[PDB]
Write a protein that binds this ligand. Structure first.
Ligand SMILES: *CC(=O)N1CCN(Cc2ccsc2)CC1
Ligand SMILES: *CC(=O)N1CCN(Cc2ccsc2)CC1
Lengths: 304, 304
């Protein structure tokens, strides 16, 4: 029993982290096979970050300008290219610790673990979600860029995030491992405001199921609702509209607990309308939305 | 910027996890050098757990009864002994992935990371604290026993926790790596109630400092207080009494922010007395007490 914000074991990713230095800029790189992936802004001076022309800046760089260090061992760069907002540095040695991996571009509401690194050295691991506004709420200081987000299915690491920038509101933006930003963000020091941070309704419901499975049942009520009625309430509270797809995905949690998805929606509706009245649910005083239905089933079933 | 509940990178510990089977019971073991550490209740049938005599039960067990599997490779047991509530199984092979390590017995209020494992296989990592009642609030299903809690200082893993049991209130009890339970708990299926779960005042203050460092300042007020006055308020709200030792430990955070510890106590006092009024602090609607001053400085300074 008990339910905790839980990250994937980080070892498989720790083995992929290197330091990338271009001139006087240091950040993190991801070494998979004989390629090191890092944010292209490694090539920039802070001066450059106001309106960088990355193709023009990159012409001035040679393979020997990219200093790549794995532990205290230097890797030899034999090639470099820009793909969108990331650099791929070809090194002369395959990473012996390369796990099975995939590159995946996640959707908003999807959760992942982040291994925060400084100088190619892991400092810690925490769990994130891709917000509906394509930001993530991270913990990232200067030097953390190139830190990656990932899911693990048994032996296969699916890399979904690379950290690139902090908005002046202290939220985080980055790319998939093809170097394409999530959302409308650009790797330039300009005016970039996040949109509405809407609550991931399907994740909140999954977490309410997790609460019931673990003894927290006080918010269960005598009511039911319809998708259309629930959604009127979701609209008012900046929740994502609930779809039949969300209802289907919650089916296993519905089945295990014997609480109809729409009944749990009517519970969520009363919580939105009435608040927690100073009570808590799984040790939280607000409605947690960074557990997916898949996350809840995993943690409740003990999958490795 | 941003501040997240953050666990140590788990790789060094992932490399120490094995499966221990005695008869029909399977749980996790910790392989350091040529010793595997596991909870002694591995030797029990559920029948045995009502009033086990571990010394009597252990006489019936030989080295060949302890099945120890690291990945898909079996380790040869060449010796076994009981130390308090843990078994030490001597194996004929040193774990090649043994990190630098220490065994430490932590105090209440101290935080650590847990690598939840099933069948010697890591499922995830999360951050805990030793509660003032010597429970921890974990995420642990059947088969998770022998999962360990740890801190990392650069290269050295300090093992502080091994998971042994769940109280019928869904909180967790376990041992240091010498097999001594935290608090009054025993590895028997009997009536064991947790004491008062008091709030770790020094951790809450550290987290309020983390909030200021990251832009959340709305709760800063015009007041100050004294230790004695603050403590009257802590008593009423089941907070640990604040000592000069706690004030000293918060000195670096005081220094960096320019907010006197006692001023921050007067902020905490108003929050205890008035509530959050539906506001949040670092994305929480309650007062977080599972970040130590050391944790806040680490995450705010980017130590690896
Ligand atoms: C994540 C990280 O380490 N940093 C430091 C370098 N910064 C360069 C930049 C990119 C967009 S605006 C300026 C990014 C944050
Ligand atoms: C942690 C874990 O896997 N388990 C399963 C075995 N249980 C045995 C027991 C110990 C005290 S009461 C019964 C403990 C929980």
């Amino acid at each position: 029993s008990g339910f905790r914000k839980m990250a994937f074991p980080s070892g498989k990713v720790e083995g992929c982290m290197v330091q990338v230095t271009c001139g006087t800029t240091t950040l993190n790189g991801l070494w998979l096979d004989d390629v090191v992936y890092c944010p292209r802004h490694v090539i920039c001076t802070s001066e450059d970050m106001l309106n960088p022309n990355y193709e023009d800046l990159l012409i001035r760089k040679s393979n020997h300008n990219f200093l790549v260090q794995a532990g205290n061992v230097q890797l030899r760069v034999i090639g470099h290219s820009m793909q969108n907002c990331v650099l791929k540095l070809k090194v002369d040695t395959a990473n012996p610790k390369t796990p099975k991996y995939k590159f995946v571009r996640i959707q908003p509401g999807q959760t992942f673990s982040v291994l925060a690194c400084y100088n190619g050295s892991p400092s810690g691991v925490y769990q994130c979600a891709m917000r509906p506004n394509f930001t993530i709420k991270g913990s990232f200081l200067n030097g953390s860029c190139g830190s990656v987000g990932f899911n693990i299915d048994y032996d296969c690491v699916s890399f979904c995030y690379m950290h690139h920038m902090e908005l002046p509101t202290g939220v985080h933006a980055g790319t998939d491992l093809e170097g394409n930003f999530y959302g409308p963000f650009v790797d330039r020091q300009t005016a970039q405001a996040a949109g509405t941070d809407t609550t991931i309704t399907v994740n909140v419901l999954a977490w309410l199921y997790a609460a019931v499975i673990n003894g927290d049942r006080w918010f269960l009520n005598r009511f039911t609702t319809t998708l259309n009625d629930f959604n009127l309430v979701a609209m008012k509270y900046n929740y994502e509209p609930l779809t039949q797809d969300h209802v289907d995905i919650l089916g296993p949690l519905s089945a295990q607990t014997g609480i109809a998805v729409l009944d749990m929606c009517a519970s969520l509706k009363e919580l939105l309308q009435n608040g927690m009245n100073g009570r808590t649910i799984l040790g939280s005083a607000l409605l947690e939305d960074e557990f997916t239905p898949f996350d809840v089933v995993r943690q409740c079933s003990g999958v490795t």
